[PDB]
Design a protein around this nucleic acid. Structure first.
Lengths: 159, 224, 211, 156
RNA sequence: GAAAGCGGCUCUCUGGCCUGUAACUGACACUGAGGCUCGAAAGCGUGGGGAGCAAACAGGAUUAGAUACCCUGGUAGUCCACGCCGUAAACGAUGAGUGCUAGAUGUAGGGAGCUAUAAGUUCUCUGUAUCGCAGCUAACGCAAUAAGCACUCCGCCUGGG
RNA sequence: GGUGCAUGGUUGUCGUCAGCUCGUGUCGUGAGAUGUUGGGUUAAGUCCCGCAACGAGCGCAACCCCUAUUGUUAGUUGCCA
């Protein structure tokens, strides 16, 4: 594609398995449209390979995604991590291609239990209404006590 | 020692609830249904309440702390006045979970209910500018919200009375934690076999809590 | 990243350890007096360092000192900082000044608590009960917000362990931090131990305003 | 204050967002070798913190088995999930014949000997619950003289 | 209806329950290996019928590619008599018989009262839900058409590939 | 010099996030729930309403400079109305 940056950052560079890098990113160039830039950046250390760090970053023309991942063998990191780039593009199919993914409230009395008409004097004093919304327990049906403007115990009563 | 159903008629004691979601254990007391509420006759509930007429005296006379809870709507001022005559304090607020077994909740309720309220009552309220007024939202609001009234009380009561355990599941479990007995006014909406007493009473009538809570704390007066 | 409380206090939000002004050789006498302060803290090698503020003056120097206690550090009766003070006169050649003042209650000092318990870490103390022990001593003795910090490094180990009982309201983000704070590295064969002691008895600390 | 036994520090975790929080737990059993056994649990970060919580939970659920002279009333059972512990009175005083997490139990209850293997699982957090149940199934001889309704002379 | 399943309409001969009932037999009961029958869905045999649909395949997008999803079609096949396979998530991954019992609850169709100057309620049986007592399990949950408590007929099951 | 997946300390980042936590307590065999669920609002876990809860922090927010209005100082080398 357009450009690389191959970088063995602890050990020297050898273009057999770097060519294998170049061929699996050749399969990135099977899944390419404009391979805008990549960069290999790998790291292996002492003590009989207690790590295998590799990296390649992926600034394509719309997306960027790097890969600094590990195995025991650096050859196995090139293997499983560039296969991880294959399965990343397998994750990047739909993430790339499928830009389509495809007055008075008309209600009854709010109280539950019935209260008798003498309790309407306390039921008007219960919630703070001048009337008393209570299904009458003493009187058969519904009764309510209003407040007459003279100052006595009123009765809003069909009765 | 009886103030009976001959006067407990109209004030709204011996009545059920709206005739739905009742409980099959409590049917030998509550019989009828008409006009929205169950109506309770004088057969068993007279001597059933006379049981409480005996035992509220009996728990009262040994000189222990009593407790009333009137969280329900038409029942705060009864627990107010009968906490006054009973002597021990009132619970008239929506019930706070975690009351008994956590010490520093009610202990800090004491210290900021009255002891940090001594900063209000002494020379700290008038020496601080407007930023103390929101400190008196914590004080002037969170004291009567987190009121308690527990500062008189140094030790767990004898009785946990409650208007409704069915609306008050919480302290019923708190009272059955370490072994304090309870008193209630339990209607059709609860099964009171865990409750010590069966008082078939509801709240939003005129004087049900007034009558029953009245002579209960009168039994606390003669117990004290 | 973590902000240093004294690292934003002791310059101007708290007044200077070099609490004196000059005209031209301000950093000269300041820096070389800081080398002299290093000589104080390294020639109290049979003593206890608490705090020192060496000063330059109208008499071109007034050395301000502090001790952790007068009864042991200053001498057999007061002649170790005085004979060593004249030894500073044969170091830098000036009128040289003693100031015998105990930093009061050095169990509330971040130097003697954390550095003392770090010397006991050199004596291999169980460090968790050292944390609960020392911060319980000073939190017992007030210290409205008090914590500390110990690093790791046990005979080829990782960076830092945890820090039990690192507690106390130390609102370090806020601009009310009056904290006697310290830090320490204990160099051993098994490694180094960082000891960082936040002590918050006082509440307020700007020291920057004057009419 | 009770006579103390420590079962085990557990191994639990809290999985925070950006990592792995080290959660800490423990389980002890207490009691004063008379029939009274409790058990505690430490849901904390460190060992004496789980001793703190271990006595916070060990101080309660500490009840009395009707110890008929350092023995059992009769053969009982405990089932709580995989804790399946059948306890057998046998000849007594000649060897504390128990599992590991229940030998502390008849220590702190004071039984002379038992005969107690377990089935189900050796999971200790069900062993202690099945042990509470194995004490719970017990009616006693004063009740068979009393609650049964007749002072029966099998015990009299 | 044992399930599989069963819905234009009308006839033909056709089981199976439940409600009541003792009129009557006087235990005739429950099962159930074996053996037997029925039985999804396709497909297979012969012979028809061949609308619409659609395996197979083609054409056009699709992309790196499309033997796929979409579209255009379009063969087998779907339907009718007439024989077969005997395997389905067969399910509710919950065998059959019967006994027991908190209740809130659906709806059928009877039996009975019922409410009477037409209204509208209560009990009883098989049905099929939903919540939830007890019980209950690893938990999830079940709970009157029990994942609760019993017994008789059978069957399965032994760590994974 | 080597050895920063061996060293301390400093150190850049997410993230100037608004979230993170913890104690008491309850509940759940157990990890786990509680705060943190809550009603709008904010930049805010801001407060606030119900709440098994309550409190404590860690906090953006709060305290620090600088500039943005006026008095006390008034000629120094700088201001002349």
């Amino acid at each position: 594609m357009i450009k690389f940056n191959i970088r063995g950052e602890n050990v020297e560079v050898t273009d057999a398995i770097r060519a294998y890098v170049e061929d699996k990113i050749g399969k990135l160039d099977k899944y390419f449209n404009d391979g805008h830039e990549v960069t290999a950046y790998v790291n292996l250390k002492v003590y009989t390979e207690k790590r295998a760090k590799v990296e390649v970053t992926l600034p394509a023309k719309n997306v960027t995604l790097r890969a600094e991942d590990t195995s025991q063998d650096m050859y196995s990191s090139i293997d499983f991590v560039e296969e991880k780039l294959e399965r990343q593009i397998r994750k990047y199919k739909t993430r790339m291609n499928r830009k389509p993914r495809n007055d008075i409230v008309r209600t009854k009395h709010v109280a539950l239990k019935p209260m008798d008409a003498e309790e309407a004097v306390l039921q008007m004093d219960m919630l703070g209404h001048d009337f008393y919304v209570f299904t009458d327990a003493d009187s058969n049906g519904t009764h309510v006590v209003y407040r007459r403007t003279d100052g006595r115990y009123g009765l809003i009563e069909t009765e | 020692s009886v103030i009976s159903m001959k006067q407990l008629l109209e004030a709204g004691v011996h009545f059920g609830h709206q005739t739905r979601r009742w409980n099959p254990k409590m049917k030998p007391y509550i019989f009828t249904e008409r006009n929205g509420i169950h109506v309770i006759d004088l057969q068993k509930t007279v001597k059933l309440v006379d049981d409480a007429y005996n035992y509220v005296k009996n728990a009262s006379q040994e000189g222990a702390v009593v407790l009333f809870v009137g969280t329900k709507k038409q029942a705060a001022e009864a627990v107010k006045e009968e906490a006054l005559r009973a002597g021990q304090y009132y619970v008239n607020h929506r019930w706070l979970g975690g009351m008994l077994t956590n010490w520093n909740t009610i202990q800090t309720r004491v210290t900021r209910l009255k002891e940090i309220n001594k900063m209000e009552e002494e020379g700290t309220f008038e020496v601080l500018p407007k930023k103390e007024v929101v400190l008196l939202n914590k004080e002037r609001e969170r004291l009567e919200k987190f009121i308690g009234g527990i500062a008189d009380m140094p030790r767990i009561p004898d009785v946990m009375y409650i208007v409704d355990p069915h609306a008050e599941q919480i302290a019923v479990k708190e009272a059955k934690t370490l072994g304090i007995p309870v008193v209630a006014m339990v209607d059709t909406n609860a099964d009171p076999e865990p409750i010590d007493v069966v008082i078939p009473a509801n709240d939003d009538a005129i004087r049900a809590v007034k009558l029953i809570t009245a002579k209960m704390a009168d039994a606390i007066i003669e117990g004290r | 990243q973590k902000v240093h409380p004294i690292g934003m206090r002791v310059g101007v939000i708290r007044d200077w350890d070099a609490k004196w002004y000059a005209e031209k050789e301000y950093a000269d006498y300041l820096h070389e007096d800081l080398a002299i302060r290093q000589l104080i803290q390294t020639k109290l090698a049979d003593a206890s360092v608490s705090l020192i503020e060496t000063e330059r003056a109208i008499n071109k120097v007034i050395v301000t000192l502090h001790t952790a206690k007068p009864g042991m550090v200053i001498g057999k009766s007061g002649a170790n900082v005085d004979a060593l003070r004249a030894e500073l006169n044969k170091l830098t050649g000036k009128q040289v000044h003693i100031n015998i003042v105990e930093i009061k209650k050095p169990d509330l000092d971040a130097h003697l608590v954390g550095e003392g318990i770090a010397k006991q870490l050199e004596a291999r103390i169980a460090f968790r009960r050292a944390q609960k022990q020392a911060i319980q001593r000073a939190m017992r003795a007030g210290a409205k917000g008090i914590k500390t910090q110990v690093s790791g490094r046990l005979n080829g180990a990782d960076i830092a362990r945890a820090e039990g009982y690192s507690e106390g309201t130390v609102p370090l983000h806020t601009l009310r931090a009056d904290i006697d704070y310290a830090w320490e590295e204990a160099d051993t064969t098994y490694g180094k131990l960082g000891v960082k002691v936040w002590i918050y008895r006082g509440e307020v600390l700007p020291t920057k305003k004057s009419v | 204050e009770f006579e103390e036994r420590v079962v085990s520090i557990n191994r639990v975790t809290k999985v925070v967002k950006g990592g792995r929080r080290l959660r800490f737990a423990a389980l002890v059993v207490v009691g004063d070798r008379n029939g009274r056994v409790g058990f505690g649990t430490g849901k904390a970060q460190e060992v004496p913190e789980a001793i703190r919580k271990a006595i916070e939970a060990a101080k309660k659920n500490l009840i009395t088995v009707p110890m008929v002279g350092t023995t059992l009333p009769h053969e009982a059972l405990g089932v709580f999930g995989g804790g399946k512990i059948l306890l057998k009175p046998a000849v007594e005083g000649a060897g504390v014949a128990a599992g590991g997490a229940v030998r502390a139990v008849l220590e702190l209850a004071g039984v002379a000997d038992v005969t107690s293997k377990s089935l189900g699982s050796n999971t200790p957090i069900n062993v202690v619950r099945a042990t509470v149940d194995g004490l719970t199934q017990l009616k006693r001889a004063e009740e068979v003289a009393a609650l049964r309704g007749k002072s029966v002379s099998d015990f009299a």
